[model samples]
Structure formats: structure tokens, C-alpha cells
Target: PYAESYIDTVQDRMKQRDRESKLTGKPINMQEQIIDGWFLARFWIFKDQNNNHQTNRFISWFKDNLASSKGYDSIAEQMGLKIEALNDMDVTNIDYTSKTGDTIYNGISELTNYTGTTQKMKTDSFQRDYTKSESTSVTNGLQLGFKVAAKGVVALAGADFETSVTYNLSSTTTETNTISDKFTVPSQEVTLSPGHKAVVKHDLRKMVYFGTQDLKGDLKVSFNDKEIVQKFIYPNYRSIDLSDIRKTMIEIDKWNHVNTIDFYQLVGVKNHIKNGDTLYIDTPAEFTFNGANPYYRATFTEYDENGNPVQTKILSG
Candidate 1:
């Protein structure tokens, strides 16, 4: 006198029992019985403009506090995400997904511009010391920014997977150039001692930071000899501080491994920069004319102070 489906139902219901089964006492409802081939899944999904809004909020929050506490929580840790000191945390990655044959429109973009200065001048000596009269001018650097949209196609893969597509779009929000040109050189005279002719040169190139133009780091000139390094002083100019440049500050080691000095000071001034140009020097040495005295051994009637073209000293016979 037993039901025909009793065995099948009993085995299936027993295998998929609820959490209350381990409890001491309590009878569950009959209709709540579980069935075979049933599985439960959970996910966090946002639709339409809600996705864009939420994504932007999260990214902004991450940027503001990334340098210190209240940063992104890592997948393995309970507190803030622990990043290695040598890792590059400045750049970020993101993604956009669309339904089958659906085109997502009106997206945002990022843009940046560079504005800075370079120098020019000349020197009479080989070891030119143009620490006195350098000049410079400026305009712009390279451009940065992206146009994105959700206008791509999703390729159909196997049953459980599908490829994603994206389109180039524009962002209503815009970031303007914040770094300004603060480099200036004052004109002055540098006289060499003992009637020695002085050498003078200028720097005609701007120090532009990569990934973000106009965001310049300090110009460092290090002289290496016998494993003892010494940073040469840059005279005749002020250091431009790009501290307010945009983007999160990241802690990275050996970031200057591939950096370049632009070789502006010596080459720029020696070639004779155009009018209204400013220049910078690499060292603190003053300009010295005839300091080495290449013409000292020659018998010539010309004197440096007398304005005669002939050398004044008699030649040794």
C-alpha cells in the first residue's frame, strides 16, 4: 500500500535537505522538499546608467585614498590591499560588457595637454660656463586622451562562454592642464681671471614627464667617478615643481632607470639659441675666457684688453 514514486522522492529529498536538518527539533514543510538537477547561484550585476555611475564612484574612491590608508582591500587580506613598494600602482584597468548585438552609447573619455619651456645660448670656451646669460621659450608637448564607446560585437562562443565587445565613447567630465611654466633665467656677466677667455652654453630643452606631459620631475645631473657619485649643481635657473600634476602617487623603486636628461644646457647654448630664449647650466663653475690659454705660446701683438687683433706676448725662440 506504498506510493509508486516514494523511493525516488525520498532519496532526492534526503540528499538536498535544508540547513535545519542538523537542528535538535523542528519539522519542515512538505512543499519545501528539494529536487534533483537543482542548483543555486548568486551574483552582483548593474544595468543601464547604474553600471556607469557605480563604476565611476568606485574608481574615484580608489584614487583619492590609494596612497595611504582606506585603500582597496585585496582579495586575500581582510584590511586594505597590501601592495609591494616596488609595484606600479598608478595605472588602472577597466572593462565594459554589452548584451548580444546591443550597442552602448554616450561613454566618457580622458585627455591631457603639455605646456613648458626650453633654453638656448652660446659659449666661447670649451668648458662653457653660461651660468649667467641663458634664455628659453615654450609652447606645448605631446597629447594624451582616449575616445571610447560600446560599439563592438560579442562573438558567440561555446554554451557557457561568450566574447565581449566595446565601442569608443566620450566622457562628459574633462581634465585640464594644471602644471605651469615657472622656469626663468636672469642675465649677468661672468668674467674669467688672468685674462682667460670664458666658455658659455645654454639649455634649450624642457624636462617633460612621461605618461603625463607638463608633469616634470627634478632635473638631476650626477657625475660618476671611482664609484663615488656626486650630483652636479645646476646654476642660473630655478627648479620647476610639478607637484600638482594629476594621477595617484605611487611608490616605485628604480623608476628612473630609463629616464633621460635631454642634454639641453651644453648643446642648446653652444648652437646659439634664437632671441628671447632662456637657458640653464649643469654646474656652478663661472664662465672663464682664456682660462686655459691656448694662444699663450704664440707671439702675437694683439692684447685682450687693448682691442687689437694681434697677440701681445712675444714667441719663445
Candidate 2:
């Protein structure tokens, strides 16, 4: 119940860094540096959430978004994803001790977009502290403790939940996206000969998260022999209209054969946990947490990424 090293450790480290900086002259010696590059995530889980991970199904975004974009949504995206859909096995296992950390494949997409224009790919890589993250396993042990504790629960009260590792995810470019139920097509030119027009499905491309209160936990869990699970209800998400970075993908034109499209809604964990519900922490360890809350529907006009379709392309004859 008492926040011991939780506060003790932070204070302790502040002084620890201070002493090291004096010795090295430049704090860069003690402080960490982040490199610029790509850190592509792997497809750890598919429709099969039954097994945390059956086989390592790796999906890469190499400059190419053609057939693969449409190929994946219809294929891999079709299967119900596990928690790994958003996170990786390294994070899920809470494992980061080896010399080589998580295998987050990197690089850019040399592939062409719908306009047949070659695109460049760039993203940031996360580096775990060698000694720090390597130290209570670097207090990530404590970090997990901090995780459940952040939920306003005593689940991590007594455990030596201490964390020494820290890392950041990066990217080469960023665009401002907004949350709206109805987004206009910016009035682009189209062959105006009205027939049957409707927003059948969304060709989902890269999902940009502006949604808050993310949950960090594998759905099923056992915290210290205590069945402390992160329960959730499949929410009816909202449709996100296109903006700057968003406007690129959804180019509507009378295409080949298409009708009544099926899409996906990002399955979300319940944001607001009840008052009495709690996570457990016996002498041993495990974790589960509902970050914040108030998530909304973020369905968009599919970007080569089609799965969940909620909008209708209204056309009158």
C-alpha cells in the first residue's frame, strides 16, 4: 500500500545521473540517445487469438501498398486478431532481457501507391536501456507495478515493481488528423453521371491513433494466482473522415465490380473500469490495465484498406 522505491528509486536515480554526468562532463555519456530509422511491427497474431501466437506471421510494409493492401485486409485482417495485433510478443511476454531485443523488422515501402507513384517509408526505432532496462530486469518489473497501480489499484503495492528501461517510437513525418463523423472528399473532380453511388466499405490503410485510453494487457490473465482479467465489450466505433495525411488514399471512382462491402471496427478494451474492480498482485507477477477511457468509433473511408464500412455513397437517379 505504501509507495516506497516508487518514489525512492526516482529520487535515487536523479542523484545517480547527476553524479555520472559530473564524471563524464557531457551528460550525453549518462543520458540516452535515440537514432533515426524504421521500426516495423510484425503480425504476431491473426484471427486466431486462441493461442497467444501460433507461428510468427510477419507482415512488412515495404514501400509497396498495391495488391498487398487489398490482399491483407481480405486475408490476414479477416481473422480475429489477438492482443498482439496492437502490441508485440516482446511486450506481451514482458520479456526484454537478451542481448538482442524484440525483432521489430525495419525499412521502408519502395512500393507504389494507387497513382503508381513510388513512396518512401520512414519510422522511428525504440531502444531499451542496456543496463537500466537490464537492471529488476531494469525495473520494467516496477514499471508493470506502476502500470496496474496507475489504474488506482493496490495490485502492485508490495511488489518490488521497479523499472530501469525507457524507449521511444519515432517517424520521419507527421500530419495533423482530426476526429469527425462526416468528412468531405474536399470536392474532387469525378465523372458526373449519376447511377448508384454509396460508401460501400472502407479500404483501411495505416490506422493513425488519435484515440486515447489504450489498454495494455493480453485479454486473459492471471495476476498472482488471482484471476484478474481485462474484460471488454466490442464497441461500435465511429467513422473518421479524411484530412491532410488522410486524403491521400480514398480516391473514389466507378471501379470494376463492387457491392455491399464488409469491413472491421478496431476492437477496443473497455476504457473506464468500475470502482470496485481491481487487479491482483501476489508475491509473483502479471499485469493488466485500462489506460484512461472514452473511446469512440474511428471508421474511415478505406485506404487500400477495406474491412469496416459504415458510410453510404448517396446517389440519386
Candidate 3:
């Protein structure tokens, strides 16, 4: 409808222009005629029957709604368009009041003040009053309490916790010894009358006799009045082989009893035999005879004054 109305108005203006030109006896301008003809052709082409109804409807809607902001916004909304209002404000040194009602200070001075407050708070709390001695006391008390608790637990369980104990046991050893094992014998003192001899029989395999002092004379040993060891003197001690005498005398039956032979000892005469200057017959407790050699079997130990045996030897026939 609007397309038809707009075309009709343009055609009426062209006709009035022609009538005025003819009444004024003026020639019609060819350029104006050509422009109007071109416009009319274009308008008619645009308003073709197929698009004329739709174009008329669009123009009517735009004219009715485009005059006010609300009407324009409604039209823009339907066309997927948006409009926003922007206002420029100064940012330098501006104190922004936040939504939370706090004044947010801007610029370098505000930042410097904030850092100074932070440092002051840190300095106020930096040094604490913690004494090392008090801490040590607390630690010691805790350790002692733990030790007591552990000991109590052990006691309740009837268990022993020992730090030190005796780990050694008592020991005993038994050793068998023979009669001839004797290395020292007790002294037997005797005194002989003037011009009289004394005889001593020792039930030992080997015997060593010595006078406490230097001997003034010799000592003699004999069997059946036959000389065996005669004129025997000693600076310290002398050993007598009783095994030899027992074999000779007992074989010859030169004894009152075969089992107990009568051995004779002739002690040389001196002025007087003093008590301390007496003879000692050192012999073993028993006799061991070697049947093959007819000799005494004795254990001889060589030692020094310290009684530590340096060497040992078995003495036999």
C-alpha cells in the first residue's frame, strides 16, 4: 500500500512540472525528465508484485516505532543488537570507595604506608622470651618421668631389667697326683754321739740330703757293711740312689727282712753336731722302680727361685 501511494505522489509531481513548463511557454528540461523517468523505473522495479506487499508492511512498521528511544531499543533487541553507556573518569590519585565501604587509597604514599605498618608488626613480634635453661629443665623432667614409667611397667610384669650382671660361674678341677710327684721334702734332723755313726732309711726312690752349713766331714752310705757311697760331701746337696742300694742289698739277702732292708749310713765325726747345722734327707713320699733298668722313676722339675718350672724331665733307669 505505501509503495503504491509513494509512486502515485511522484507521478503527480512530474505531471504538475509538465503543466507549469507548458503554461510558462518554457521548454521541458530533458535532464530532469530523464532523471524522473529513471527514478520511476527503479521504484517500480523495486515494488514488483512479488516484493511490494512485504516492502509496504516493513515501511509501515519502521515509521510507527522508530521515533522514540524505547521503540528503537525494542526494534534493536529483536534484531539481536545491544547498546551500552560508557563514562570516562580520572584514575590518578583517585580514592576509590569500594562496595564494602572501605576507602582504597591509591598512589605511592599509600603503598609505602602499608609496607611500613607490616614491618612494624613484624618487629613487635620478632623476639620472644624463651629461656634455654627452662627448656632444659622441662626436657630433663620428661626423660626422668619416662624412665620411671618404664621401670614401673617392668616391675608390674615381674620382669627384671638389669644394666650390670655377673656373668662368670664358679669352677673346680680335680687332678690325680702320684707319690713321686713331690718336688720338696721336709727336713729330718739327727745328732750322732762322739765316734758313733747314724743310719737313716728313707722309703723313697730318690733322696737328696744337705747340711745347712758347709760340712766338716764326709757322709757314707753302705749296705751289709759293704761301702756303697762313701766319703760323700756336699757344698749344697747330694742325691742318693736308693734304688741301687735296694736292688743290691735285697738281691744278696743282706737284710734281716727281705721286705725291709737294713741300710747303714756312716756320718763322719765332728766336734759337735749343732741343731741348725744338721742334715736333711729330701726324698719323695713313695718309690717307683723301673723293672728294666732297676732304677728309680722320678719326675724332676727344673726351676728358679721364683718356683716357676722352666723345664721338666722324667728321670728313670
Candidate 4:
């Protein structure tokens, strides 16, 4: 008494290719459901009672031309809900509690202010300036006027004047000096100069990070998801014998081709989402992170390939 879920069995083989394109009268459900890019519109239910007029004209051509068509108008305003026509010609509503509610997780907590922009790491260490010029020698007194106060009344001493006259003091001078500087390295401690292929560029929107900053392309994302269970579906299509959907969408040949048409297999979902930082961060002012941007854990400056000194790395969301 049940069998309609391998997601209503591939949306009933995409509703049997829009019911054999309406018996080949060209009812290709207005574009056999956008093949593989995300705009799955397949709810053209069929239970014809003759005057059902082509199952209500293919459910009014799939809901008034894909709901006034034109690019899914923001894809059903981002997941609303549709396809629940009953009295019109089809009614089978069951909810085995499978449409409860729980699967909404947006994340972020440890990456606030994101403060990543200390961009000042580019150095082969250079700062040299020098000057030197010196020449000097200078020394003392001069006087060569040999006038040894020999007054004429000094005959008494003049007699002993074996005339001792020696007066000629000293002299010597030569000077010049110039010594300029710059070229000294001693109190060293300027870590992380370990890059030769670094011409740098990192802007994670107001970034701020530290330590393990070997980042070059490992934002590392290999994550994916697949969960379509809008209630253990149950659409026992009368009986299974249309040659299994005419040998199924004939051709792709991989257990029947379903390149992709998953809008909860034709409108059928109950989803929700919410994450932390009190709904999405941005409230740490009066207490700190003052207007945010105070995260400086690690540092990165291993550049040598040439220039760049003001890029971001906020590392948050």
C-alpha cells in the first residue's frame, strides 16, 4: 500500500517526462525542468477523468507558467511552498510527522573583529649609510722676539750675562673630522622571513590572524550535503507498468538518467536555519573589541619576491 520515495521515485521519473510530453503533443512542461542548475518545477499531477482536460492543462501549465515565469523570480522567494491542488483534480495529503522542523545552521563564533592587516613583512634587511673623514694635529705657543730685558743698568748682571737669551715658544696645527653612521645589527628578533616566492595579496575583508599563517590556498573546502526527506513520501502511482516509465528517460543509461531535478523532488520541504554570535555577531563595543578589530594572534611576513604592504585578512565569515 506504499511506494513513492526514492524521492517519490525521482519525482516520478520527473513526472514521467511531463507525461510523455503530454502524449507527444509537445507539453514539455515548459522546458523539461531546467536541467541541472537549480530551478526544479515539476508538480504537474495527473489523474485524468477524461474531462480533466489534460490534467487541468498540465496544472495550468505548471502553475500559471511557472508562476509568471521569468527566472523563477528569485526561486520561489527563496523556498516558500506551493503545489497543493486538491479539489481541482488531485488530493492526497499525508504527513507522517516527517516534516517536523530542524536543520538550520549557519555558523560563526571565534572569528570576530577579524582584524587581519598588519601588512608590514617585506625585508631583505637593508639600511646602510656611512661617512668618515679625519685629519688632526695642533699644539701650542709662539714668540721669536729675542729682547731679553737687558736694561743698560744691568751691567752687574750683564757681566754674568753670558747672555742667556732663549725665547721662541711652540706651534703645530692640522684638523678635520667627519663620521656618519647606519649599518648596525645586534638586538635582532624579527621572525618569519621564510619566503622566496611571496609577492603577497590577502584580503579576507578586514582580516586579522596569527601563527599558522601559511595560507596560500587551503581555505580547504570539500564539504557537501544531501538530505531530501520531506516526510517519508507515499505516492503509489496507481500501478507500476508503463514499461517502467518507458524504459525510463531512455538514454542517459545509468539506472535512468536524472541529471538533476531536486526541488525536494517537486516542492516538498520544511527547512530552517540560525547561527550564533547572537544571531550573527556584531555586538562587542562598550565592553571591548571596541568597534571591533582586535584580533592579532599570529603574524605573516615571509616576502622576498617583491612588494605589498596593506592587504587585509579579517578571517571571519
Candidate 5:
């Protein structure tokens, strides 16, 4: 049973400073100043032969390599995570607004099924303004409208989809920001449909996975209809070997009898989002152990004080 305390470490100058500040009644921003002495060990995910993901692998590697490393004897690593899982909810209603209209109504459109093509044409014509009057000589074009012989493909377009959830962290620390004005599914775009939900889910993970695409640019998402305005960086997955992980879990259990581990404290934790709000992880948001399409593995190394790495552990777990 190893003992690790950030405050009790004799070698920690910051701890001493914090003690002095406390005794002196001085204001100390522990986040900005005192906790500067920390290092992030990047854990990569790996797959096992049985095609299952193993969380214990990462924990084991950290205990063996990191716990024994020089300078880290007094310090310890803690896994952190935050997650938003999906839930079942009715779309309730949907509304679609056409941003564009077509002009030039040819009576040929009436040959088949004609549903107010003339009205659409008139509306489009009134809205269409040619920037160059010189080009006015060219009429929009002889409107050739075609009627549908068979049923035309159904156009599924809607946008009023909403979701509500309990805020896990403080309002100041965590928030949701809308990423787009319109979220479009490539093949099908329907509001509140399962497909639409899938698209939203895909987009959300895509941003987290790639760290590209801003969610704020899309349709307004909100917690209580107050437009979502927080951009957050979520902890993600990596790989680890099961053999080493089993050992690590035993050690972790000796201290805290946690049955399942879900989160991890990440390093190099810098987010590009603006405002004071940012992500604070308590564990890994998602997981991928050894399995098909294995995504649980990552490439990482253990580092010591002075930023010198002690060991490199790559897991194919």
C-alpha cells in the first residue's frame, strides 16, 4: 500500500508555499499558481486477443512505470473523465425554412403533378434581384417546369430538435455551446428523426475526435432554451495491455475499492475554446479496449521531474 499526497510531499515547494500562504492569510490561486507542478502521462488504448477493451491495462501501466519513477514517488496520478451519454426522447416537432427559392415557371411543369409551382416561381422572382441591371437583358430564362410522373422523392428537412440534461459541473466551469445553425445529414435531413439524432451524435464525437469543426457555428443548442454557449474539450480513449492492467487494478483496489474505472486525468490539457469556461475531467469520457475496430489504444510515455521521460509504454491490449 503506497501513500501519495500532493500536500504532504516534502519535496514540493508549491506545497510549502501554499502552507505559508494559508498561515499568512494570503490569497493564493491554487489553479493558476500552486498546482503548476504536475505532469500528464499519455495513455494509449490497445486491443486484446479476445476482441475486448481493457481499462485495467492503462491503470496497471501507470502504477508500475509512473509510481516507481524518480520524483513521482511523492506524487501520484489520478484518472479523470466527463461524459454525456445518449438517451431516448421524442423529437416532438420539426420546422424547416427554405433559404432559397426558384424563379421562371414554365407551364411544362404542370404536365405532371403540379403543386403550386407558379406560386413558388412568383415568390422566387420577386425575391431574386439581379445585381447587374446590364444582365437584365437576359431574362432569368424560359421557365420550363416539369410535373412529377411518379411520386417525387420526399424532402425531409427540419431543425427544431432539442435536448436537456443535468449540468454535471458548475455553470461557470462547464457549459454547452451550439456548433452550427443547421445540422445536415448528407443523404437525409430530417428534424427529430433517429437519423438526425445519429448525425448530431456523429458531429459531436467528430469534433471531439478530430479537434476540428467548431460546434458554435451551428444551430443553437441549449440546456434550458438559453442558447448553448459553451465549447468544451472532452476526455477520450486509448489502448492498454490487460496483463499489466490487472496488476495495476489490484494496487488501485488496495487503496480504493472502485469496481469499475471510467475516467482519467489527461495531460498537455490545453483547450482552444474562449471565455473562462473549459473542461475539467474526472475520468475518461469514452473507452475502447481490445476489440474489432479497436480504438482504445494510444502511444504514450511516462515522464519524470525536469520533463525527462522515465519509460515508454505502448499497449496493444
Candidate 6:
């Protein structure tokens, strides 16, 4: 059957080559025809085993003597046919098969209906959290107070007094002179002299007063004063003049502002994870601030190769 099919294929190629050369008006190439014809003749001889026994014997002798002994022996050994002991060889056990009655053939087995463990793969669960802490400082500028006062006064004091004494004795002197002794009357005529007259003047005095009163206190101030108290109340103040340090808990969450874990790195967990391997955190992870430092801590459970549970902690910022 094999020889007949091979001859038919060679004849078809010869006709195809002939037809194509004629159609293109080119000279026919006979190289393929020659090779095919040579194989066809040998296939005929191979088919007629009864009539070509002598020729087969001579060819066999040439193969035995002229062919590389090592190469031929190897080929024969693989086919379960030793060249020298061919007559008594057992061919019944030549068909390879498994003990379960499954046929064995060369090359890889048919890989159908097979689902690989790594296929359709996905992470069981992914979780991430971010937190930040801030610090601020406030400095009071200054305290000030001011006061002023003014006063004015005006006063005047003056005294005026006048005294007058009446002199009525002038009239009585004229009458007494006539009655006096006649002898002294003539001599007393011009003896009286005018008493000295006196005059006095008085003046008033006036006084005026004006003044200004000013006062200042709390003048004693310093940056290191005991009364100048400065305390930093955490997260109680903000500064527009200066910027603060800002950061994210995880590097991946810097821009996203949310959990953005790389689940691809969790390939090691695929073996234990299943279709419904569910995990969750009730509350978002939190971080605490100690002074200016921040930290995060979490615990997880995983399985070891021996199927034992191992608990671990994750501490990072």
C-alpha cells in the first residue's frame, strides 16, 4: 500500500511540473522527474519481494558490508531486529503499551481536556492602606497697650479795703479862740501846720497751670521670657507660609490615594488559593504617630510545605 501511494504522488508531481512548464513557454526541468523516477523504480522492486529476492539479497549484502556497522546496528537494535540474529527474533512484544492497556507512541501525548494549575490564574486577595501625620508650630507676634492724659487749671485772688476817719473838730476851734485869754489871741493865729498826708496803692495777682500725664507698662519683653509660653498642640495649627513633609504609606499609593498592591508578586500563593478564596479587613489599616515618627503593623497567616499554619507579622511605614 505504501509503495503504490508513493508512486501515485510522484506521477502527479511529474504531470504538474510538465503542465506548468508548457503554460509558461519555458524549458521543462527534468531534475525532479529523474529523482521521482528513480524512487518509483526502487519502490517497484521493494513491492515485488517474491520476484526480486536475488536483487534484494545483493542489496542486503551491500547494506551489511558497505554501511557503517555502528549506525546500522543501532537502527536495527532500536527496531528489535539484531542484524546477525534476525531469524530467531521475537516480534510479539514489539508493540509498546502501558500496563493499563494504553497505547504508547513517540512524541508527546495528546494534551487535550487538560487544565493547567497556572492557567486562568488570579490573586486570592489584595490589600493596602496609607496613612500620614502632620506637625505645626505657632509663634505669637507681640502684645501692646497705650494710654494718655491731659489737665489744665485757672485761678484769680484779689482783696480791696478802704478806711475813712471823719474830722469834725475844725468847727469847734473857732468858737474857743474868742473866749481865750486876750493876751495869747494874737500870737496863736498862724501856729497850726498841716499834718502830713499819706497815700497807699494795692495790686491783684493771677496764676495759671497746664500739664500732660502719660503712662506705659509691660515694657519688659523677650523671646526667652518666662511669661512667654510656647507649646505645640499636635494637629491644632496650620501654616500657610511654610510647607510640611508629605508622604504615603506605600510607594504605589502615592498618586492613587488608595490601596494599590501588586498582586502579581503573589504568585507564590496560587497553589493554596482557590476559586472562592476570600479575605477581607473589617476596618482600614491604621498608623500611629510617635512624635514625628509613624509606623504600621499587621499580622497574617499562611501555610507551610508541611501543611502547617504559620503566623507572621508585617511591620513597616
Q: Quick one: best TM-score, which candidate?
A: 4
Poorest stretch of ten by lDDT in candidate 2:
30-39
TM-score of 3: 0.16
- lDDT (tens digit, per residue) of candidate 3 on 1-317: 23455434434444554455446533333223222332333333334445555445544544455455565334333322211112111111111111111111111101111222212111011111111100000011110101111100001011121111010000111111222222222232332222222222222222211111111111121112112111111122222232332233343343234343221211111111112222111111111111101112323333333445444444332
- Clash tally for model 5: 56
lDDT for each residue of candidate 1 in 1-317, tens digit (9 for 90 to 100): 35443223332343334224324222222112211100000001111224445433433333354344523222112211111112111111122121221111111111111223221222222122211111111111111022312211222222222222221112222222222222222232332223323222232222211111111111211111111100111222222211100000111111224322121211111111111122111111111111111111112232232333322333321
The runs of at least 3 residues in candidate 3 whose Cα sits more than 4 Å from the true structure, single-residue gaps closed, are 1-4, 53-317
Task: Estimate every model's Cα lDDT from 0 to 1.
Answer: 0.20, 0.20, 0.24, 0.23, 0.22, 0.22
Alpha-carbon shift of residue 106 in model 1 (angstroms): 46
- TM-score for every candidate vs. truth? 0.15, 0.15, 0.16, 0.18, 0.16, 0.16
Error of 6 at 287 (Å): 94
What candidate 2 gets wrong by more than 4 Å, as runs, is 1-158, 168-248, 253-317
What are the per-residue Cα lDDT tens digits for candidate 2 across 218-273?
A: 21111121111111112221122112101211111012132311111001111111
lDDT of 6 by residue, 118-232 (tens): 2221112222222222111111101011111111110111211111111111111111001111111010011111221111111111111111111111111111111111121
Least accurate 10 contiguous residues by lDDT in model 1: 34-43
Residue 166 deviation, candidate 3, in Å? 99
CA deviation > 4 Å runs, candidate 6 = 1-4, 51-317
lDDT per residue (tens digit) for residues 90-195 in model 5: 2112222222222211111111112322211110111111110000010111011111010011112232212221221111122222322221222222122111
**Residue 311: error of model 2 in Å?**
79
Candidate 3 scores a C-alpha RMSD against the true structure in Å of 74.3
